[PDB]
């Protein structure tokens, strides 16, 4: 059991992350990455998620930062070599974190390069109201602003808002469609309640014809 | 300085 | 233009039905059936819907009844020869109406046979909460009761209720899932409203650095 | 007598 225990450690670490015990998430990821590396090899497609989560938690630990870069770039390669949309989106995510490492490294022109890389990938596969696109636009405007490109920084912040505003539009439509569906489901339920008496009459109508009926009725017909 | 990265984890829902 | 005008006449008649001008729906159907018969032949698969709607409106007109039978049985054949679920369900519907013609004809053992035929078909392809199954069970219990089989009549009426009750169960779940989805869509909308100020700060933060910034800032970096 | 067929068109939603 190796693929068995490796997924467990991914869960362990992911929720040590969401809880914020990061040395304990790094630990979970470092061993998952070690169980897969020693079963499939440390460039194998089976190691891509494990390495990306490992480098994600290495980036957070530096908040070493150089080990985050190795692990995220390895993940990008593993991810980009496969032509699945799931994998291409994970490649985008590895670019997003590689850009986050650049910003920690005060290397702002590369963050722009990695954030743009994430965005070009994500816009091929995601709808114009995906918060992930609001995140890349915002992270891109951060990089541009840190790099002191203030006009392109504003442009990216406004793109972020434009995505966030588009999603409030879609969500309000889905409210009206949910609450409207709810309205019709409720109306049909009452329509069906009012059918059950009329059918119960037909049942009792029949039970009386059988009580009053003798056995010869059917066989003389 | 690092409130910028918290706003990012807020723009994405995680 | 023949397939062009034939669909129009199906619409015309269908809504002369839903309005209740039945001689005007029969007229629409008789000509659609004549446009398809003289282009594809009067056993062709292209004539199945047109003949079924025609015989459906002939049955209602008798409320002649013999012409309803011809047209519905032709439709059943056209429908059953094709292995599509849409066509098999239409075959079931032709059986339902052929059974309705039997009841008008005081021929109750055949109604049982045709209603059962509808049901065996519909239970292969429909979910246990489809009102169409409540209709067949009810129409079947009518036939059984008219034929003076009172115990099987009750059985079919109770099956009808059982279907109707199952659908009230499914509809209440969909209410809770709609109104619950609505609840979460509303919550995320407010979460997104509270993001737009923080991003607008980042924009104004940047616009001030550009106002105060001169042109040499970027090119000396 | 023919209220029976109206209840059927009510059980199905048409």
Residue numbers in the entry:
A (entry chain B), C (entry chain B): 38 to 100, 175 to 332
B (entry chain V), D (entry chain V): 120 to 133
Question: What does the original paper state about this entry?
Answer:
After extensive crystallization trials with the sNASPc-H3 α3 dimer and monomer, we successfully solved a 2.85 Å crystal structure of the sNASPc-H3 α3 dimer (stereo view in Figure 2C). Moreover, the groove is amphipathic with a hydrophobic pocket located on one side and is surrounded by lots of conserved and negatively-charged residues. The most prominent feature is that the main-chain carbonyl groups of H3 Arg129 and Ile130 establish three hydrogen bonds with the side chain of sNASPc Arg242, thus forming a helix-capping interactions. Another feature is that the side chains of H3 Leu126 and Ile130 are bound into the hydrophobic pocket formed by Arg242, Ala245, Glu246 and Tyr249 in NASPc α7, as well as Ser271 and Ile275 in sNASPc α8, and Leu306′, Glu309′, Ile310′ and Lys313′ from sNASPc’ α89′. It appears that the binding of H3 α3 can stabilize the sNASPc:sNASPc’ dimer. Our ITC assays revealed that the sNASPc single mutants R242A and L306A and the triple mutant E246A Y249A L253A (EYL3A), all disrupted complex formation between the sNASPc dimer and H3 α3, whereas the other sNASPc mutants (in dimer conformation) only had intermediate effects on the binding with H3 α3. Superimposition of the canonical H3–H4 dimer structure/fold onto the H3 α3 helix bound by sNASPc shows lots of steric hindrances, indicating that the H3 α3-binding mode of sNASP is not compatible with binding to an H3–H4 dimer in a canonical histone fold conformation as observed in the nucleosome structure.
NASP and its homologues share an atypical tetratricopeptide repeat (TPR) domain. Here, we report the crystal structures of the sNASP dimer, the complex of sNASP with an H3 α3 peptide, and the sNASP–H3–H4–ASF1b co-chaperone complex.
